Structures are given as C-alpha cells and as structure tokens.
Design a protein around this ligand. Structure first.
Ligand SMILES: CCCCCCCCCCCCCC(=O)O
Ligand SMILES: CCCCCCCCCCCCCC(=O)O
Lengths: 40, 193, 244, 268, 244, 268, 40
C-alpha cells in the first residue's frame, strides 16, 4: 500500500514516458465547501 | 453530495423522482421509506454521483453520508427517525425494530437538513459493489436504511397536506474504491457517426 | 437577565443513536446529579458486575400516543417500560440486580397555530393508589405505559400542583417542541431487582388542553425516547422477565 | 515517484449531551456538502488508516488502452483512413464525460488483422504504412499516390503479422487543454446546428493507412489509445443517456428515469 | 526427562464458574496463542464494540452424551453450539459481528477397570462433506451437536490419522479423566457473523472402544463445557438467531 | 535474499545410567509431540549439519506454474471464458489442501494451440484477446460485441503462434487472506447445500477469450498459474480421497482405507 | 547450500517480482509443544 516506481525513460521526449505513479493529495473543499463564510 | 432518485415508484417520471413524499398522517409510528444499501446496479443509489462512480469499480469500503432536506412550508412541522440496520436479516417491519439499530431523530425547524451517517460496519475491510447472483456476491450484503414518522407532519389549517424530502448522498473521507471495471449501462450497437 | 437563544437547539448522542431538537428548553439534570456507577464503599454484592456499555447505554423509542381532547395523562415505570426491549432488557432479565440512570427525551410537535401545555415529570418511587389498591397491569404496565385516572391527585393522594418539587420540564407549544431530563439512580439501597421495583415514573400530563385554529386538528402525537445510563448488573443466572 | 497516500481513519468517540454543538443539523441550501463525520454521530472506536487511494487517481483512471478507431482496408483500393477523435466508441468517451477540460499525452497501439470475404481469419504477410495527415497536407487518393513519400508527414511501417505498432504523442492542441464539451460555434458569422458544440482545436487530423503492395485479403486496423500524464479540471455530471451520434450529445430519452422502478417506496 | 505429576490437577475459573479436575493431561493452548482482542490496525468496523465480560466470558455445560459400543464420534460447531444459550447467545444474536476465543473442557470419567481412548480435536474451518453435500441440520446442529458418519475420513475427505496436526488432547482412560483446550480466534478477516460462519469445530472421536471387566458396564457419559473468551461485538440491531 | 538455513546436527553421546532422567518415556495425551532426540536414545557420534531446507519452504513448494484452466474456443462462436478458481485441476488443488489460509500473488502464463476437428495440430495465425471481466461488468455475447473495447477492463493481446502471454496479479481478496476451506454459508437467510462451503471473496471473476477475426480452426487455451510471495496459516490434514466436484469436498469412500492391506501384521 | 539471489525487479508493482529466495527459520513449537506448562 505505497507503490513506488522507477522513473527511467529511454527516450528524448516527456510524452514517451510511462504513466505518473505519484499520488497527489486531494482537496475536496473546492467542491464540498465552496461557501465564502466557512462554518463547521 | 448528489440527489438520490429516491421516488422510484412505478409511474413517477423524472424530476419528481427526486422528491420522496411526506404527508400528514392519521396513523401512529408510520413508515416513510425503505432502501436496501447497495452500490450495485438498478437501485436509486446507482444513478447518483457515488453510484455511477461505483459502476467503474468492483470493490468498495468506507462510510457513507445521507443528508435530507425538508421542502414543506415554514409553518409545517415534524419529527422523523432515520435508521441504518446492519445486515443479517430483513428490513425492519415496524419503528420499534428499526430504532434498535443506528439512527438519528430529525426535528424540522430553521435547519432544513439532517445527516444520517451510515458507518462502515463490515466484517471484511472491503465489500464487492456487485450483487452478482452467479458468484454469490449477496455475501457482501450491507443492510438497510429506513425512514419513519417519529411524531407526525402537522400543518396549520388549509396548508398543503403533502410536502417532501430531498435525499442527498456522498462518500466520507475513509471511503476508497478498488479494481476498475466497465459500466454496464454504456452500450453501443454500431460505430458512432 | 435573559432566558432563550442557543439553549433552544440540542444534540444528544449515546451509543449508535443521536437525537436532535430545534426548540428545546435547556436540559434538566435531576437534583443536579449525573448518573454514576456504584462506589466500592457503598457496594455490597461481592460478584464482579457486568457493564454492557454501548449495547444497552443507548436511546430506545416507545410507541407513540395520540394527544386527544379528553386525554388525562400517561405514565411509564422505569426500568419496567424497557425490561423487555433490546440488549438493556436482556441484561435486566438475566441478572438479579441492576443499577442505572436515565436520559429521557419527550417530544411533541404541533404548529404556531396550536396552543397546549404538557407537564413532563420524573417521579421517584411513584407508589400509586386510587379509590382502591392497583393491580399489576396498572403498577407495571410495561412499554405501553398507563394512564392517570385521578391526575389532579397525581394517583397518590397528593397534588398535581405541588408536583413541581419533582424533576420536570414543560412542553408549552408556543415555546417548545420537547423536554429532556437526565436522571441519576435513586433508591435507599445500592442496587435492586429490575422486575420487582420501579425507581422512577415518567409522567406526561396535559394541563392546558390542545386547541387549534380550526375544529378538526391533525393527529398530534407524543413520543417518548429513553436511554439507560451508567448501568451495572450483578447476580447472573437464567433470564426472568416479570414478577408474576 | 511514490503512490502511498492513504484514506482517512477513525478515532474513538463518547457520548455527547450538548445544548450548543449540533453537527447532525445541516442546511443544504448553501450548496455545501454535509459537515458531519462518523465520530460526531455515534460512539466510534479507533481505526488506523490502512486503505490506499491510487486506483481512483486521475492518472490510474485514464491510464489504460481502449479501442478508439477501427478502419477497414478494402482489397480494391488498399487504403482507408481514420478521423482522430475519441468519440467513435462509447466506453472511453463516457470516461471522459466526467471532466470539462483535460490535458494529456497519448500512446497509440495498432493491431492489424487479415480476413476473408466471409470475415474469417487468413494468413497474410505485408507491410502497412500509417501516415499522419495533418490539416492542410494533401490526402492520398490511391495505394500508389505520391503523398506516401512522407517527406514531412510522419509515418510508421510495420508488418501485418508482426508485433503491434506503437508510439506516443505530446499534448497537441492549440488550446491549453482539450475540451470534452463546448457551448459555442465552430465559426464566426455561422449559426448552423452542425457547427454548434464543435471545437476545431481538438481535431488534429487523420491517420491514413495503406499496404505497401495491393492487398490480397481484407485487413482491419484496431487503434488503441492510452491517455497518460493527465490533468483534469471542472468535474461534470456524467453521461447517463446513451450516445446516438459522434459529434453531438443528442439522446433518445423515452422514459424519463435512470434507475429501476418498484411497487412501493416502503418495500423492495 | 519426566512427564506426569502436578500437571494432573487443575482449576479454571471464569466469571462465576470454576472447573476442577484431578486427572488432567496438562493444558493445550492452540498454536501457542492466547485469545486476544482486535487490534486498532487489524480492525475495520468503525463502531465502538460491546465487550460483555463476565456475563458471556464464562463456562457453559451442554447436555451429556452416552459413550456406546457403536458410537462413531460427536462434533459441535462454534459459535453455533452456544448461539442460543445464556448472555453469550444474546450478544451473538443482537450483533452482526462477533469475534472471540474459547476455553474447552471435555470430561469423561470411568474406572481403573475400564479401557478406552477418545481423541479430542479442535478443527479450524471444518467444512464437512460426505458422499453428498450436507444439509443445515448437519452443518449447524446447534447445542445437540452432530455425529460423524465417516470418522475415518474426518467428514471432509482427509484422514483421522493426520488430524493430529490440529490442536488436540487424548482422553485415554488409564491416564486421564479429561481434556482442556484454549483456542484463539481464527479467520481470514477481523470479525464475522456468528450465525453464518462456524470458526471452530469441537470433535470427539472414539479410537480405542470402551471395554470393561464385565459385559454389562454402567452408563459412561461424555460432557462438554465451553467458555467464550475475549469477546467483542459490532453492528448492533435486532436479534437474529439463525441463518435460515 | 539468501536461502542458507540448515537442518540440525548430531553431537556425541555416551552411556546413561540414570534413576531420574528418562526421555524415552512420553505421554501423548497432552497433544504434544515426542521430546526424545537421537542423542538421548543411543550412543551417537558427531555430525556437522550439511543439509539445506529450502526446497520445503512454503515459497519453493508453491512457486512453480501448474495448469488451472483449459477453455476451448469453438469456430462457430469464436469466444469462451474461464471462471477464475484453482479448483478445476487436482494437482494444485491438493497442494493447497495443506493449509487453511493463504495470501499470495499469481503469475499467469497462457499457451494457445490450434487444432482440427479430429484434434490434430494445424497452423493458424491470429491475434487473440484475453479480457478480465470482474463481477458487475457486462459479459461479451459475441466475437463482435462492444464489450471488447476494453475501456476499463484490462486486456492482453497476443498471437496464436507467438510466445506465451504472461502477467502478474496482486493479492486481490476483499479478505486478508484466501481460504482453501469455509465452514459457513455464502448468503444470509439462505441454507442451501449449494451455498455451503462457498466463499464469494475468493471469486474475482472471469477471463473472456476471443480471436480478433472469426476463427478458422479450433484454438485451445491452457492457463498456468504460479503462486508466489506466499504466506500460509493453519496447516491441515491433507486431502486423501479423490476430488469428485469442483465446488465441494464430497468423496466416494467405498473401502475405508488409504494404505495397502497385507495378510499378517507380523510378516510383509 | 546457501543460494543467494539477485532482487532486481524491472517493474513498478511488487507482484511483478520473482519468488522470494529468502529462508525464514521454522518454529515447529506452535504445533509440536502447544501445551501451557512446558516440560522437557
Ligand atoms: C500520428 C499523428 C498523431 C496526432 C494525434 C493527436 C491526438 C489527440 C487526441 C485528442 C482527442 C480530443 C477529444 C475528442 O475526441 O473530442
Ligand atoms: C486478469 C484478471 C486477474 C484476476 C485474478 C485473481 C486470481 C486469484 C486466484 C484466487 C484462487 C482462490 C482459491 C480457490 O480457487 O478456491
């Protein structure tokens, strides 16, 4: 539960590389709490 | 949160399918709604945001949240009981049986809505989203959610005797999906042009 | 210097049950005591007790009663009313002794077009009596509860007017939607049999009758939700459900 | 690059008896989603986060090959082509329906198969040429045509019976992201329905195919596309009605319902 | 370098029950694991669990069975056999999930004039099968237990001889009066339904038949006493007693 | 990673004449295995441990490919499938019978072979597609079916006459380990014998096969599975009776014996 | 009699790797001496 892959691209262009294995943390608040005066 | 197509009674056509009806009763301890907790095909849950997202995955885990908003006039009051019944048997027959499970008592007032949290109560860690009869996936049964009149919807003289409840549903922070699969409702009989 | 604002909204959560209310009248804690478990110095029964916790320490809702024009009042004996419901009932049956407190939430909603006043009382050792000594069906009516025949005398030869000396709240429709009482255990001994002795009696009596801005009026019910608190049981054996 | 982000956990809870703090009570009118957490609604125990969320990441969701084109080369002409869209097949198209804007690279894989008139597999070994024909370049008319010299247009040559051909493509739009949807017209001083919802910036051209020698048997090209290095913006209500046409969103909509119906709302 | 002296006497006390024995063969702790509660990291069900303690964590004695000359063997599924007895049964019914260990004490006394050998086994996931797939009355026989039809094959197509790989003790009359097994919870998931899945099977099989210094022989029974250990329950609702 | 663990050795012993220490005497009633070692029973010499134990390790025991499926694709339909179990063939099934719970990864290798009606080998070159169809995904009905687009379902394409196809799979169960055996029912409020001993958590779905063009000749798929990264718990008495059915443990049990019989116990 | 292998996995996921060549030492006592009051 934390799959760390090998970058390594044998080609010149970035497009040639495989899929990004990195996990960016999500921020649902743009969609869940789009209110101005945030209350909890 | 997305709105549940909860009023799926035979004969109800769009938009009205989004509003569960509540009305002044002449009977005590009456029932308002029943829903089998499934992220798997056909049911009201399946057409929602969470539900069509589940059409793409094969396993799930986590807590779900249901927020209901009352649509009656400002003068109309009421108290309802929302209950989640862990699996093992069938849907609660009466309110006395339903109140024995996980529940919330909602009071209509200035706060239009209430939230019923359906906690992750499973033996597994993960459940399958399908109810596939061939592989016996009803093994992964998750229970039932029922709604009852706690008091009654009472109105002033001449007011609308029927109002509604709009149910919304969303996944909670401990919710995750596993194994991508294809949607069964997105078909093609020929190449598009 | 002020008496109503944020005290109107409330949420109580016990075990897997939560209650909310948007028109409360604060919370009444009987005699200022919060339910508590039996002390090592006050105790007497030597066996290690059973403390069920969440399975029993939660809210149970009884069948609703309709508030009618000729309604005199209703009452429920505790633990009697709950002795046969859920995990609380099971523990009360299987043990010879029981001790516990209560969280009571009486609810009755109407409209700004109604008027009526209910007195909600928690009476300790409410030994009843009318023109004759009561029968089992009156003294221990179970979950269905009983009804006052002589509410003016409080079914005990005393008085409804002086009953305010007992823990209480009022459900006055122009003001509130419900009442909430927290009750500690009361008895002259450490523990007692749940099937032979009723410690508290929950009483609901209409003092100002229900009137409406029309002659009809929709069904206006009264619902009682109760939660056992800080319970402990001793003297485990087979289950025995009533004193009959 | 590591994919170890976890789902949230659960911490222990106790009984609440508060005349002020009421998280169960919401107000959906604000457009905000409920604020209530498991812990504030029931007495909860402690659960340590053990579940991962990588399979729902935008990259993992789109990062697998899907059929997007399937041109058929006839024996009489020995040449076909394919307009580059992802609108011909429903599965991928519906996956993309979740977002408004998407920026990504593509990996194409092409599988060639020969068949008989009765569409049964046959053995056939030749070399085929796939040529990228961008807007403005002259189109080939025959298997013979001079346009196949490929002086500037890029081309890929592979055997009919050899491993699949494969290559990557950068993010090509003149725009800053592709649009899955477009509420506007393709041209100025034009208001034709056929030009509404058509965003030319998404059309990079055609892929032309031919065999290096006149074809003996049919030959069908299956074109697979893998979306990778994905960036998505503005989520949408996904597509529920079936797709009828390739260039617009019209649907049949006979019965106005999506989920199944039942006798009563009070019984299953 | 020695194998029998003070290991012959034993006393086990759980809750309000104590067992004694003057001819034991030591105590067997399955896989060397003592029953234990579910870890915060291993857990998944979010609700706070019910931990009954003394009310359920105690010894229950089932109806005795007579050891006859034609007796093939007996078995009980756990928690099945106890799902409807006492406070343990109540908790198992009222909850969707259960987890727990066991303390098993099988007893069979005879005389120095008898001879016979019983094999006492604790089989994990004892999925049974004979010439045909078993019916509910065979797979979940309740407190009465079941009987082996094909003991040589251990009712599963394996073998009685290789069954010693499972936690076990022998009740060899010339040596001992009884057997004691302590079993930890075993499953491939954290918790499970007490009414749909049997984790352990207690099996008692005569390997050397009962013989006596006469042809008659008094009634020689076999009694099973079992105690739930380190139990916890989740998913509270109404009581559901069987998977039927 | 090193596999150098050794078996135990033997040290020298001498004569014993003790009225207290008696290791030869046991008491099997305790459920404990004998405590006696070679040295305490005979005068022994010294032997230095020279033997390894790696070939009996759980990993080495299961770590080799075995036949687990063998679907046959007919020429009329040009499509078959395989329910993913390891219960169809006896050799692997019996190896797993030694344990109750097993957690592991799998390496599948698929070999395709074409034949004639009389089952003799023929030459046939096409590309086949293997698609993973998880529970809930729509199943393909024809070689033509739209489900083969594989928008979300993963697929593997390889040649009939090319090297074997091969890939790995993680530990997929919803459970924390697979169960080789299950003393319970598949559903609630159901007590049917067909649902006893069936643990749905072990069934991850089907593998569907098709040729990319209608098949000219038969085509049989041999699916091999290699269990790797193995963890085993709770050893069992292994299976002695033959397997009759795929989903239960019924056996014939005519003669109640396993080993061979002899005339006397006092002679061979 | 001590086969030490090369780890090296050219793929991103752990499942992709070959079989574990490591030898964990066995402990038969869970099965051979499951008695509480251990005697020798
Ligand atoms: C061999 C020449 C390759 C050029 C390929 C450009 C591919 C871009 C695909 C963009 C799809 C846009 C979405 C849509 O179909 O509406
Ligand atoms: C191409 C999709 C691959 C998915 C494969 C999952 C394989 C898991 C095998 C588990 C076998 C369980 C044991 C049994 O057969 O009873």
């Amino acid at each position: 539960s934390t799959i760390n892959y090998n970058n390594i691209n044998y080609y010149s262009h970035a497009a040639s590389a495989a899929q990004n294995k990195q996990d960016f943390t999500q921020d649902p608040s743009k969609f869940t709490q789009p209110i101005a005066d945030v209350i909890k | 949160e997305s709105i549940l197509e909860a009023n799926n009674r035979e004969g109800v056509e769009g938009v009205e399918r989004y509003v569960i009806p509540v009305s002044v009763q002449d009977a005590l301890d009456a029932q308002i709604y029943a829903l089998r907790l499934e992220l798997g095909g056909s049911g009201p849950l399946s057409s929602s945001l969470l539900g069509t997202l589940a059409k793409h995955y094969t396993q799930w885990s986590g807590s779900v949240e249901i927020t209901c908003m009352f649509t009656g006039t400002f003068m109309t009051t009421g108290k309802v009981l929302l209950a989640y019944t862990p699996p093992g048997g069938d849907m609660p027959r009466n309110r006395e049986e339903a109140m024995l499970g996980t529940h919330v008592i909602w009071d209509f007032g200035l706060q239009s809505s209430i939230t019923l949290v359906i906690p992750w109560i499973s033996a597994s860690h993960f459940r399958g989203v399908s109810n596939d009869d061939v592989l016996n996936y009803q093994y992964y049964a998750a229970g039932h959610v029922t709604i009852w009149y706690q008091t009654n919807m009472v109105i002033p003289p001449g007011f609308p005797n029927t109002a509604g409840i709009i149910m919304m549903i969303a996944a909670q922070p401990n919710f995750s999906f596993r194994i991508q699969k294809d949607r069964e409702d997105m078909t093609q009989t020929a190449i598009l042009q | 210097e002020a008496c109503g604002y944020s005290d109107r909204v409330a949420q109580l959560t016990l075990g897997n049950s939560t209650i909310t209310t948007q028109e409360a009248a604060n919370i009444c804690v009987a005699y200022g005591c919060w339910p508590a478990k039996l002390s090592d110095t006050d105790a007497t029964s030597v066996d290690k007790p059973t403390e069920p916790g969440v399975s029993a320490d939660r809210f149970y809702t009884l069948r609703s009663k309709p508030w009618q024009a000729d309604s005199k009042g209703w009452y429920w004996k505790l633990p009697d009313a709950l002795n046969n419901t859920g995990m609380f009932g099971q523990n009360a049956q299987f043990h010879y002794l029981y001790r516990g407190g209560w969280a009571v939430h009486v609810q009755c909603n109407a409209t700004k077009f109604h008027q009526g006043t209910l007195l909600v009382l928690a009476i300790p050792e409410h030994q009843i009596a009318t023109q004759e000594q009561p029968a089992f069906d009156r003294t221990m009516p179970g979950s269905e509860g009983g009804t006052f025949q002589e509410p003016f005398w409080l079914e005990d030869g005393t008085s409804l007017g002086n009953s305010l000396i007992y823990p209480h709240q009022w459900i006055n429709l122009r003001t509130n939607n419900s009442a909430t009482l927290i009750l500690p255990y009361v008895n002259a001994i450490p523990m007692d049999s749940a099937i032979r002795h009723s410690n508290w009696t929950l009483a609901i009596i209409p003092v100002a009758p229900l009137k409406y801005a029309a002659e009809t009026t929709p069904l206006v019910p009264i619902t009682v939700t109760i939660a056992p608190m800080e319970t402990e049981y001793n003297g485990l054996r087979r289950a025995i459900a009533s004193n009959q | 690059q590591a994919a170890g982000a976890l789902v949230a956990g659960t911490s222990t809870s106790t009984h609440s008896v508060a005349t002020d703090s009421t998280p169960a009570l919401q107000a959906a009118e604000t457009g905000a989603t409920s604020t209530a957490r498991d812990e504030s609604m029931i007495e909860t125990r402690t659960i340590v986060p053990t579940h991962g969320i990588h399979e729902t990441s935008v990259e993992s969701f789109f990062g697998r090959s899907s059929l997007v084109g399937m041109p058929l080369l006839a024996t009489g002409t020995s040449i076909t082509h394919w307009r580059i869209d992802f609108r011909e097949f429903v599965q991928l198209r519906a996956k993309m329906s979740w977002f408004t804007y998407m920026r990504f690279d593509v990996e194409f894989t092409i599988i060639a198969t020969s068949s008989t008139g009765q569409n049964v597999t046959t053995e056939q070994h030749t070399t085929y040429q796939v040529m990228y024909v961008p807007p403005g370049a002259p189109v080939p008319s025959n298997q013979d045509s001079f346009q196949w010299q490929s002086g500037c247009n890029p081309s890929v040559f592979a055997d009919t019976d050899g491993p699949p051909a494969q290559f990557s493509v950068p993010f090509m739009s003149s725009a800053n992201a592709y649009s899955t949807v477009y509420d506007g017209y393709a041209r100025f001083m034009d208001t034709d329905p056929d030009r509404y919802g058509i965003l030319p910036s998404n059309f990079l051209g055609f892929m032309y195919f031919r065999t290096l020698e006149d074809a003996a048997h049919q030959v069908r090209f299956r074109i697979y596309a893998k979306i990778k290095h994905t960036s998505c913006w503005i989520p949408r209500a996904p597509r529920q009605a079936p797709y009828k046409k390739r260039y617009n969103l019209v649907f049949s909509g006979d019965s106005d319902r999506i989920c199944s119906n039942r006798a009563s709302l009070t019984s299953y």
